[PDB]
Amino acid sequence: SEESQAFQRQLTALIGYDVTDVSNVHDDELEFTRRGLVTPRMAEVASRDPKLYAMHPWVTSKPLPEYLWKKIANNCIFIVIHRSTTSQTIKVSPDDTPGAILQSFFTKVLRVCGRDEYLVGETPIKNFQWVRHCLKNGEEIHVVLDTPPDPALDEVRKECDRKFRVKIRGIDIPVLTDLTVFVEANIQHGQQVLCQRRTSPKPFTEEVLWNVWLEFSIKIKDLPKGALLNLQIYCVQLLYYVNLLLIDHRFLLRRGEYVLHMWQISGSFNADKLTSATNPDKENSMSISILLDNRAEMPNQLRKQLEAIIATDPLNPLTAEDKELLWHFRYESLKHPKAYPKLFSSVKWGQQEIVAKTYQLLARREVWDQSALDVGLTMQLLDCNFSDENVRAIAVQKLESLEDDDVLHYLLQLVQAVKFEPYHDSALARFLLKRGLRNKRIGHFLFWFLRSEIAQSRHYQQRFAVILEAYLRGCGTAMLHDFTQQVQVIEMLQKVTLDIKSLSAEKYDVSSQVISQLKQKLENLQNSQLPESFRVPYDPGLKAGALAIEKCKVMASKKKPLWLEFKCADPTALSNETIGIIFKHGDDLRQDMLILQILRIMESIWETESLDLCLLPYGCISTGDKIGMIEIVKDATTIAKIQQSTVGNTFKDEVLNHWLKEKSPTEEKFQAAVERFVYSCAGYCVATFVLGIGDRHNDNIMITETGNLFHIDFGHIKERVPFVLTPDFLFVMGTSGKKTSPHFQKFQDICVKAYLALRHHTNLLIILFSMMLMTGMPTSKEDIEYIRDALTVGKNEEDAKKYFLDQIEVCRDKGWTVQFNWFLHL
Numbered sequence: 001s002e003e004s005q006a007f008q009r010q011l012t013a014l015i016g017y018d019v020t021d022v023s024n025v026h027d028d029e030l031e032f033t034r035r036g037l038v039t040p041r042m043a044e045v046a047s048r049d050p051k052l053y054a055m056h057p058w059v060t061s062k063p064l065p066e067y068l069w070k071k072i073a074n075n076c077i078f079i080v081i082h083r084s085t086t087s088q089t090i091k092v093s094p095d096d097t098p099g100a101i102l103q104s105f106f107t108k109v110l111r112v113c114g115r116d117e118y119l120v121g122e123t124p125i126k127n128f129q130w131v132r133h134c135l136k137n138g139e140e141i142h143v144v145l146d147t148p149p150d151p152a153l154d155e156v157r158k159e160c161d162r163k164f165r166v167k168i169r170g171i172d173i174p175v176l177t178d179l180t181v182f183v184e185a186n187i188q189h190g191q192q193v194l195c196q197r198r199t200s201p202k203p204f205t206e207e208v209l210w211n212v213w214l215e216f217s218i219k220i221k222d223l224p225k226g227a228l229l230n231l232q233i234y235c236v237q238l239l240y241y242v243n244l245l246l247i248d249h250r251f252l253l254r255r256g257e258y259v260l261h262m263w264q265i266s267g268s269f270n271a272d273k274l275t276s277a278t279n280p281d282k283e284n285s286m287s288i289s290i291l292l293d294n295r296a297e298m299p300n301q302l303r304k305q306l307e308a309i310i311a312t313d314p315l316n317p318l319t320a321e322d323k324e325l326l327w328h329f330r331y332e333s334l335k336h337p338k339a340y341p342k343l344f345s346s347v348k349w350g351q352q353e354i355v356a357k358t359y360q361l362l363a364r365r366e367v368w369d370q371s372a373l374d375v376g377l378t379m380q381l382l383d384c385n386f387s388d389e390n391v392r393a394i395a396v397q398k399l400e401s402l403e404d405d406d407v408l409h410y411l412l413q414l415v416q417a418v419k420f421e422p423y424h425d426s427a428l429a430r431f432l433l434k435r436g437l438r439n440k441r442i443g444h445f446l447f448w449f450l451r452s453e454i455a456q457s458r459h460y461q462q463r464f465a466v467i468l469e470a471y472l473r474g475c476g477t478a479m480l481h482d483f484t485q486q487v488q489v490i491e492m493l494q495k496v497t498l499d500i501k502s503l504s505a506e507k508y509d510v511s512s513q514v515i516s517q518l519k520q521k522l523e524n525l526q527n528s529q530l531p532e533s534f535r536v537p538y539d540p541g542l543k544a545g546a547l548a549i550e551k552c553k554v555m556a557s558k559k560k561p562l563w564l565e566f567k568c569a570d571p572t573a574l575s576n577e578t579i580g581i582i583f584k585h586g587d588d589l590r591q592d593m594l595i596l597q598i599l600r601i602m603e604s605i606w607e608t609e610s611l612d613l614c615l616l617p618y619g620c621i622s623t624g625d626k627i628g629m630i631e632i633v634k635d636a637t638t639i640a641k642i643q644q645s646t647v648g649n650t651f652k653d654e655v656l657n658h659w660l661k662e663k664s665p666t667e668e669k670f671q672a673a674v675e676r677f678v679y680s681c682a683g684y685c686v687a688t689f690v691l692g693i694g695d696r697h698n699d700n701i702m703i704t705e706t707g708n709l710f711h712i713d714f715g716h717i718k719e720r721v722p723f724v725l726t727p728d729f730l731f732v733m734g735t736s737g738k739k740t741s742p743h744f745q746k747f748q749d750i751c752v753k754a755y756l757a758l759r760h761h762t763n764l765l766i767i768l769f770s771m772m773l774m775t776g777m778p779t780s781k782e783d784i785e786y787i788r789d790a791l792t793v794g795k796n797e798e799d800a801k802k803y804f805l806d807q808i809e810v811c812r813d814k815g816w817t818v819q820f821n822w823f824l825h826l
């Protein structure tokens, strides 16, 4: 069972989709996966330590960077321990374990003050990510000595040689000028079309019957597992598509009569174009009716030709000659882990004997299994180009080597790669499931990532809902309760936002009656509907309480987002500084998340070289359909507001440096803010250029009261500019027009340092950019090819440097021209 069904309805409301539903299925694949995921779930649930699971220590194995070492040049770290009224400092060694620190206190568990963050485990104090954050931001480590959480709170509820042929019967649309239509049928494996047959064109009426056998060149014997029957309707524009796996989840050849509801084309290779899901909109979609009733040493010239192809970028095209060379010299190629994506692409997957030879090659995998982990290389074997389950599994096996900290870095992109999986049950989906069940911070973000996709994609909601349910059946009752609180808040907040948008007109000014109407709605919610407290979706250590209703406003944007301010539910909190969240409707925040995540990856790439470029990747989490939560960075303003304070537009190079010294109460702070500005500006010019999101308006660029520059709103994105480096930015650097400056020559120094460092991880970035465009930007070959030129691929560090320095010179030669042209719109 009775309560066994009351739990499934809880699960459904938490997921945002009912997995028990068989209304849009043509086989048991979803149900088989739903059952197949119980084993890996139970295995991980039974293997995790309960107390370390409860305290989820956020830690790293990585060295403490050189810049944070200067911050503690004394070899002594101060930790202040609180208990009721008492608070006492303790001199600690960076290498000390929290247990050894605790020993020193009791001679005279640890929880971060105001956060659900624990400094527990056999890790040194220099390796805790909260300690590193204090070091970087020049903060004092305030901790409280309390009782550990009880693990009983994390408990789980007890659970032939013939040619292939397809008969196409016809097509039917409920509602349709007098045009012409035909059906194109493709045998696809990865992005490769193994065979293509078409029907004769028939007039485009609402019922189009053919009754034709489409006999392909491929033998049934030769059909590879994970091959798709891609059925397309053309009129020459592609209007409809649908896919069918030819070999099912139990290795059987697909047979019988099918009535498939198809996807419409709107306005190129999207992840949506690969889905095995059928369109659930039965009343308005197009349907298709089908029937299935079926060694000497290498010459130097060649080794060099082979090395030159192996060394090449992931977006460099492999010619037939390259593919034959790679395939012929496959045992030499196997010696290079970097050759693996190229070598697996040179395989004729439509030939059973070649696939067997490929599997034989995969068995001689000592040099791959030995090799150090390259995530960029691993991600390449997980994109749209690899559809083989054994090729993909060797990538997933490399991921198992990642520490939890690295999982969170790639998690979003890893969840998106599940879209490229032929089957619902994959090594990738099981890996994500196991990692989320092991660490609460991974499971927290995995929930929201999986949820954002269920609510915004019809193409993949069915697969992601089976993965979420498998996670939510193992995360444990406390985790379940947290998600419940969080989902309740978002739902009532979404309600409020839609009502606010409706009252307002299209007029620039947000009505003062509307901002009062909001104040009344938020008061009528807090009284008996809204939960007393919830975990912040984009910062799960941080718990929000009751709204500060007098601080809540509607932002003067045409999407009318909600500026919300909450009290911190934690009594031990160091400050009375409110928690600020932007609740926005209309924008699909997945793109923003994807860009904000690449920003974090670029920060790690930089850390690898002891380089800190002070980026500010603010919290941003897609919570549902066209909705989400955005972190409000406290003590921050837009460059456009600084440009409207002393100037007051309907600009001036002076105002920024003027605003910085006005905001800094001391000279050693103002100059620190100027270096912070020059590093953050360098960082954002570099990051923004390689991503091609450089040409921005002053409005979408912010700065903190500490000179920390940061771009915002990457949603959407004649005279062009590579990045934003307007004369006001140059004024803080102490220059005008074409003039040298100690800070400016240093800014060029940081840019080149940062740019050449990003170029050291070219492959990782290209693959992430491509994956982002494929799974989050609904793209073409040209749009993807941008980053190749941006990262000056195949070029030496000198030519590459001459490129970025000229980019700086473009912004200087253009001044405020492109900036004013942005304002000329308004």
Ligand SMILES: COc1cc(-c2ccc3c(n2)CN(c2cnn(CC#N)c2)C3=O)cnc1OC
Pocket: 557, 561, 580, 582, 584, 587, 589, 592, 618, 630, 631, 632, 633, 634, 635, 636, 637, 712, 713, 714, 715
């Ligand atoms: C509403 O549209 C967006 C805004 C931001 C964004 C992010 C951070 C901040 C803001 N907007 C505004 N803001 C801010 C303004 N004043 N203060 C200081 C305070 N309190 C903070 C931020 O920190 C990010 N993405 C968006 O669209 C996808």
